[PDB]
């Protein structure tokens, strides 16, 4: 997979999209730092030197996008496990979390955009970048956890290798789509929790998380069982 390695850019997602609009496919845009990194729904994503910031552009018909959406977080988890001894988990939708002192802090996130012919998967992982003092309460870096500077090159390389082997096992039919979902549920720290979810239509849904599937989250609320697509969830607390 072709990798365009930049020293800086506004956002790897936005730049990957311009290139994708013009025809490019199956490539990655990696940037040592971002001047305007973006998170889900209007969030800013601090992208100082030391972090891993890249966007993968894939053919929309390479495989089921809904399956890919679950595969990405899974691969990140399994790759980071090789570097961290602490508990890793997935917070709905795709926050990559690490347990610290009976507390979960965010190590990274995923921002995805899907079009008819391609999907852009933006991945941000806090590796050696310094987390702003204010949010050190909810965010953390791998360097803070391990006590050592990790190699961002190796991390990316292992992520890609892991992601591709899974891709080849799915198409080769060595593993079912459901097995990917089972891995997701295994790492999910959201299922079984009582939550208040803010949606993009201003509604707030409160309830017990029974399950998360390829389409979204399933909650037991006052109204009964409610299903919510992951793409419209602005905030989950
Ligand atoms: O947790 C989130 O809200 C999503 C964060 C996504 C961050 C990555 S960094 C690479 C890519 N470029 C961006 O501007 N955002 C994504």
UniProtKB/Swiss-Prot annotation:
PROSITE patterns attached to this UniProt entry: BPL_LPL_CATALYTIC (PS51733)
Protein's UniProt keywords contain Acyltransferase: no
Entry annotated with the keyword Nucleotide-binding: yes
Example GO molecular function: biotin--[biotin carboxyl-carrier protein] ligase activity
UniProtKB keywords: ATP-binding, Biotin, Ligase, Nucleotide-binding
Gene3D superfamilies xrefs: 2.30.30.100, Bira Bifunctional Protein, Domain 2 (3.30.930.10)
Pfam families from the UniProt entry: BPL_C (PF02237), BPL_LplA_LipB (PF03099)
Catalysis: reaction(s): biotin + L-lysyl-[protein] + ATP = N(6)-biotinyl-L-lysyl-[protein] + AMP + diphosphate + H(+)
UniProt GO BP: protein modification process
A GO CC term assigned to this protein in UniProt: cytoplasm
PANTHER family on file: BIOTIN PROTEIN LIGASE, BIOTIN--PROTEIN LIGASE
UniProt record similarity statement: Belongs to the biotin--protein ligase family.
Name of this protein: Putative biotin ligase
């Amino acid at each position: 997979m072709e990798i365009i390695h930049l020293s800086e850019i506004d956002s790897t997602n936005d730049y990957a999209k311009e290139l994708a609009k013009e025809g490019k496919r199956n490539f990655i845009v990696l940037a040592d730092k971002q001047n305007n990194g973006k998170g889900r729904w209007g969030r800013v994503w601090y992208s100082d030197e030391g972090g891993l910031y890249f966007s993968m552009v894939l053919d929309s018909k390479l495989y089921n996008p809904k399956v890919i959406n679950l595969l990405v977080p899974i691969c990140i988890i399994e790759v980071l496990k090789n570097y961290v001894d602490k508990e890793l988990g997935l917070k709905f939708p795709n926050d990559i979390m690490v347990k610290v002192n009976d507390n979960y802090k965010k190590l990274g996130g995923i921002l995805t955009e899907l079009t008819d012919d391609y999907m852009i998967i933006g991945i941000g992982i806090n590796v050696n970048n310094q987390i702003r003092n204010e949010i050190r309460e909810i965010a953390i870096s791998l360097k803070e956890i391990t006590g050592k500077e990790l190699d961002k090159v190796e991390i990316l390389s292992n992520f890609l290798k892991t992601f591709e082997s899974y891709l080849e096992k799915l198409k080769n039919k060595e593993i079912d789509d459901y097995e990917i979902l089972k891995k997701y549920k295994k790492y999910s720290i959201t299922i079984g929790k009582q939550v208040k979810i803010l949606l993009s239509n201003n509604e707030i849904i409160t309830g017990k998380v029974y399950d998360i599937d390829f389409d979204g989250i399933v909650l037991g609320t006052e109204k009964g069982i409610e299903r919510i697509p992951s793409g419209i969830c602005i905030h989950v607390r």
